[PDB]
């Protein structure tokens, strides 16, 4: 990835082996958790499309998920070309390159072309666009890897409220929906699926009670 | 923005003059990058020390066969051959730099510099650059060629590179 | 490997022991799977032929694969020498003699000569050529390690569709026969070998079905 | 080692603690496998005889192998001193004296003399000769650690051809025979020592047998 | 169909009856086989869209195949209208307006307009476009009339190799999925489905074997 | 095929449907026999490569033979390319370029280019070269279609000499060998394989007896 170099002139610095090893280890140890998306977004800050292609090729296993990621990248490139076609217009006095769906995906774009598109003024946000595409793909993958539906989350007879709410919020974060749907679900589904012993306790507190009040109520 | 490359021409080792070319990378980018990179020699192989093997007075000077030195070879920086990028630009006059080929989608490294308007070539050879400085050096070169192309003296690209 | 300085020039640098350790560890732990070529290309960016000969000789075990790679490099060097004969006689003062195939390999040349080739004007990319040759050899090696053929894939009555498609795409990436042949295979062989119940669930969606709906059909 | 400063004079630098730790770790972890010689030649690059003596002394254990290596270095130094006369008397300024065998071994010299002999014009590869001697010694050591001979390898009835050729090439790498004799061995004994089934398979394959087609034929 | 004269110009000519008779006879007698497309392309060289609509409507029987061809022509006509939109504004004096997707078929245009389109300056090849569409439709028809898939081919214990390879190449030319995939199939599926005795006779020649030696091996 | 047109100017005349029907009939009844090569050469006199491709595509069935023919055409094209290299570069306005190895087979050469190559002065014999290639292929195919070898031809006990000599000469013509070898083959095989009584009858005439005397010997 390119980085601000002293003084004020961005030059290309190849991806460090330690970053690739950290990525391989986090994909090996954590599989495909919701948190990987932030770890991926933070490990590849300002990365050229070639670096993101390297980081997606260095993965070991989960080839089905990588295939969905590649297909969604292709779909985003296709839609991007459809949303950004060259309509006839007077030619600009200044010419700057332009990134195609295939030029953004780093397939047919040489490293020099990407460095140009990034360091030129005005900059072309090819890296951020490809990162948005990969993040959409990773969201698809992590929502697919969900073992059970959020509607099936129910507490055991003696399962403490601690582990119950932990697992429930984990599955809810892995689940995909708008924020208002989650706001309705945390009020309609959480208290209902609790164990009756502590369900009575949560009902005694009130419907619009916060999480900490219920948690300290059923505490112990 | 558009690259400029030069060639210091030599006739049997006597220095003759410098021809410099503006490559139209804004319309034929992949064709222009291949001539630029072969001129710098940055990919390991190129034009430096190759010769114009076929010079026809009043038509064009052709060169660029750095592997076989007689029009049967040459290779591009993308492999031995690549597609005809497009045909936006036409053969409008002397100084136009156009790609030689062995039919469609067979571009390698051979190029020809026109010394006349050759509209019959339009639609069949990709044009990707024009002489900037040095056209009388291209004109003087004609004298060392013949109707069938055979040249009388060895005409070489003594040195070449990028200027801008 | 060469590294640029503050003013932009580059000079030889000793190979880091961390790179060698990571390469040997990933070769030992991940054996010879499709995800060694991207990591190899990322680890040795800008490495001299001596550094690549180091990274290859340092691989203990799997000596048959290393011999295959050596034979492939030998054939590529012979073809390079045949396609680019070297000239004889005195060499110009401003130019260094062009390398032969055995010297492009870095077997019979000093490190200083490699650095002079890589930092010449214009630069000569011996490292990139030898890296391309090694990548081709590694592709042939990962082709050889392929456990099963692409046609023999048939899902068991109990083996889930996820494991089936995982194995399929794993051996498909390990095949690397071509790209359009791979595209035809993922259309035909993927749906041709499903378990009868989920098979007809996929046929209910027709050939226009994508992989996501293909999986969520048999899901749950 | 002696790192060459960018566009400047080559500056001496002490061996890195990271380099020495990696060296002692690989020694302790892998004992004396055939790859320790390539990894040693990789870690120690451009190093002075003082650096090489330090890298040898940091090794703990295997004192028999260390004494054999020191005896090999002594024999090489004796041969060098016998076939190279040593001059004496007053020496002209700006020109170092004749390096003796005990000095090229680093046992009777100092870092100043080593750097002087490595910076002279023309340079005298004292480091490259002492490293050659150390590699000869390490070759003797790895030959001594060879558990079984090469002529006594026989494939098991159930042991597959891949494992058989792996062991065969490991023992071949450990073998001490010259490269010209080394070729005939891998040409003949490989197919002459295998199990009868794939032996007849490779016999039907006939001449020009290469490892790739051999392994593709002995499949299943 | 148009025909050139002594002066060099062309003009419409009435369709010959023993062409219609030959086409109807070859369609009925040979039904649908891969060798009906070359005969169709040879019979109607230079035929106007009216002549092609004649040659298609004249085919009695197999009305399902003719409806498939009509549907394919229908979809192809729609694509042509979508890909190119008529320009607005004043038209040049030396040029006049073009046909539509449906008029390429000749469904809503008289014969004189077809002749004017075909002999205009520059000429417009409506006949060749509609012939390409009809050839694609006939390819789909002969695909449907294929009696098996390419994978189900397995030679019987008594069925000679000649009949096996004949059936294989027949259904392969009737497949027309691609050309490079065909090249991979003729290498793999041809060698993978032989009878065990002749199978190992073919394996004796390796993958480098050509078809001639492939058959003369099992011959006699 | 092109034909001399009044007066003295060759113009392109498309292949007539009756010629194609005659070819389909002769490849329907005669199938593959020695007489097909002469019939093919007479039906396609002076045919452009497109006409020969049309005549080779219209054959229904016998796909193995057509594939052999295509592969031998490719082999002859490769040999022509290896013997007649084609130099790249701009073409002269008056004369046409030298046809490549694949321009002869009509694969990538448009009909206009072939018409040019044939009508130009001096003419390029593309049609005769492609006819020689197809004739080599047809000779291969008819020598393959031979049911038995010439050495296996033997007369029955009461099978008349007429049928025996007819079958023997038919198999000998279908067989492929130099005429000089056939001169010994006839004098060694014709009399030996005959019936014992007719054997003595022919041996009474002499070794160098002509065919007519040998026939009239055992006549009736």
Curated annotation (Swiss-Prot), chains A, C, D, E, F:
Modifications the protein undergoes after translation, according to the UniProt entry: Phosphorylated possibly by host MAPK1; this phosphorylation is necessary for Pin1-mediated virion uncoating.
Region (Dimerization/Multimerization of capsid protein p24): 145-220
Region (Interaction with human PPIA/CYPA and NUP153): 57-95
Compartments, record wording: Virion
Sites annotated Cis/trans isomerization of proline peptide bond: 89-90
Subunit structure as annotated in this protein's UniProt entry: Homodimer; the homodimer further multimerizes as homohexamers or homopentamers. Interacts with human PPIA/CYPA; This interaction stabilizes the capsid. Interacts with human NUP153. Interacts with host PDZD8; this interaction stabilizes the capsid. Interacts with monkey TRIM5; this interaction destabilizes the capsid.
Physiological role: Forms the conical core that encapsulates the genomic RNA-nucleocapsid complex in the virion. Most core are conical, with only 7% tubular. The core is constituted by capsid protein hexamer subunits. The core is disassembled soon after virion entry. Host restriction factors such as TRIM5-alpha or TRIMCyp bind retroviral capsids and cause premature capsid disassembly, leading to blocks in reverse transcription. Capsid restriction by TRIM5 is one of the factors which restricts HIV-1 to the human species. Host PIN1 apparently facilitates the virion uncoating.
Protein name: Capsid protein p24
Gene field: gag-pol
Complete-protein stretch covered: 133 to 352 of 1435
From Swiss-Prot, chain B:
PTM-bearing positions, type Phosphothreonine: 92
Protein name: Peptidyl-prolyl cis-trans isomerase A
Subcellular location(s) of the protein: Cytoplasm; Secreted; Nucleus
Keywords noted in UniProt: Acetylation, Apoptosis, Cytoplasm, Glycoprotein, Host-virus interaction, Isomerase, Isopeptide bond, Nucleus, Phosphoprotein, Rotamase, Secreted, Ubl conjugation
Reactions performed catalytically: [protein]-peptidylproline (omega=180) = [protein]-peptidylproline (omega=0)
Chief location bin: cytoplasm
Post-translational modifications: Acetylation at Lys-124 markedly inhibits catalysis of cis to trans isomerization and stabilizes cis rather than trans forms of the HIV-1 capsid. PPIA acetylation also antagonizes the immunosuppressive effects of cyclosporine by inhibiting the sequential steps of cyclosporine binding and calcineurin inhibition. Acetylation at Lys-124 favors its interaction with TARDBP.
EC number: 5.2.1.8
Modified residues (Phosphoserine): 76
Glycosylated residues in this chain: 107
Effect upon mutating residue 112 to A: Reduced ability to stimulate MAPK/ERK phosphorylation
Covalent crosslink: Glycyl lysine isopeptide (Lys-Gly) (interchain with G-Cter in SUMO2): 27, 81
Sequence similarity: Belongs to the cyclophilin-type PPIase family. PPIase A subfamily.
Documented activity regulation: Binds cyclosporin A (CsA). CsA mediates some of its effects via an inhibitory action on PPIase.
Cross-link (Glycyl lysine isopeptide (Lys-Gly) (interchain with G-Cter in ubiquitin)): 27
Function description: Catalyzes the cis-trans isomerization of proline imidic peptide bonds in oligopeptides. Exerts a strong chemotactic effect on leukocytes partly through activation of one of its membrane receptors BSG/CD147, initiating a signaling cascade that culminates in MAPK/ERK activation. Activates endothelial cells (ECs) in a pro-inflammatory manner by stimulating activation of NF-kappa-B and ERK, JNK and p38 MAP-kinases and by inducing expression of adhesion molecules including SELE and VCAM1. (Microbial infection) May act as a mediator between human SARS coronavirus nucleoprotein and BSG/CD147 in the process of invasion of host cells by the virus.
One GO term of the biological process aspect: protein peptidyl-prolyl isomerization
Outcome of substituting residue 106 to A: No effect on peptidyl-prolyl cis-trans isomerase activity. Reduced interaction with BSG/CD147 and ability to induce leukocyte chemotaxis
SS bond partners: none
Modified residues (N6-acetyllysine): 27, 43, 75, 81, 124, 130, 132
CDD domains tied to this protein: cyclophilin_ABH_like
Gene, per the UniProt record: PPIA
InterPro entries: Cyclophilin-like_dom_sf, Cyclophilin-type_PPIase, Cyclophilin-type_PPIase_CS, Cyclophilin-type_PPIase_dom
Complex and partners: Interacts with protein phosphatase PPP3CA/calcineurin A. Interacts with PRPF19 isoform 2 (via N-terminus). Interacts with isoform 2 of BSG/CD147. Interacts with FOXO1; the interaction promotes FOXO1 dephosphorylation, nuclear accumulation and transcriptional activity. Interacts with integrin ITGA2B:ITGB3; the interaction is ROS and peptidyl-prolyl cis-trans isomerase (PPIase) activity-dependent and is increased in the presence of thrombin. Interacts with MAP3K5.
Annotated organism of origin: Homo sapiens
């Amino acid at each position: 990835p390119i980085v601000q170099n002293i003084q004020g002139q961005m030059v290309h610095q190849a991806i460090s082996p330690r970053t690739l090893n950290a990525w391989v280890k986090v994909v090996e140890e954590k599989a495909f958790s919701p948190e990987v998306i932030p770890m991926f977004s933070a490990l590849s800050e300002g990365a050229t499309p070639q670096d993101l292609n390297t980081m997606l090729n260095t993965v070991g296993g989960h080839q089905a998920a990588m295939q969905m990621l590649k297909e969604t990248i292709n779909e985003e490139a296709a839609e991007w070309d459809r949303v950004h076609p060259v309509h006839a217009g007077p030619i600009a006095p200044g010419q700057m390159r332009e990134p195609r769906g295939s030029d953004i995906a780093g397939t047919t774009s040489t490293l020099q072309e990407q460095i140009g598109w990034m360091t030129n003024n005005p900059p072309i946000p090819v890296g951020e666009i490809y990162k948005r595409w990969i993040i959409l793909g990773l969201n698809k993958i992590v929502r697919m890897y969900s073992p059970t539906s959020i509607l099936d989350i129910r507490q055991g007879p003696k399962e403490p409220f601690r582990d119950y709410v932990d697992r429930f919020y984990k599955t809810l974060r892995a689940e995909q929906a708008s924020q208002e749907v989650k706001n309705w679900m945390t009020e309609t589904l959480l208290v209902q699926n609790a164990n009756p012993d502590c369900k009575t306790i949560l009902k005694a507190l009130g419907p619009a009670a916060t999480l900490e009040e219920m948690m300290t109520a059923c505490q112990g | 923005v558009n690259p400029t490359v030069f060639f210091d021409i030599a006739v049997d080792g006597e220095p003759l003059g410098r021809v410099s070319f503006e490559l139209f990378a804004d319309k034929v980018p992949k064709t222009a990058e291949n001539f630029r990179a072969l001129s710098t020699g940055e990919k390991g192989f190129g034009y430096k020390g190759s010769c114009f093997h076929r010079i026809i007075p009043g038509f064009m000077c052709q060169g660029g066969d750095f592997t076989r030195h007689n029009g049967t070879g040459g290779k591009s920086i993308y492999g031995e051959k690549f597609e005809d990028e497009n045909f936006i630009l036409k053969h409008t006059g002397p100084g136009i730099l156009s790609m030689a080929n062995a039919g469609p989608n067979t571009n390698g490294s051979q190029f020809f510099i026109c010394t006349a308007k050759t509209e019959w070539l339009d639609g069949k050879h990709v044009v990707f650059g024009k002489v900037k400085e040095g056209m009388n050096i291209v004109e003087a070169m004609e004298r060392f060629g013949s109707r069938n192309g055979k040249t009388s003296k060895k005409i070489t690209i003594a040195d070449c590179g990028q200027l801008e």
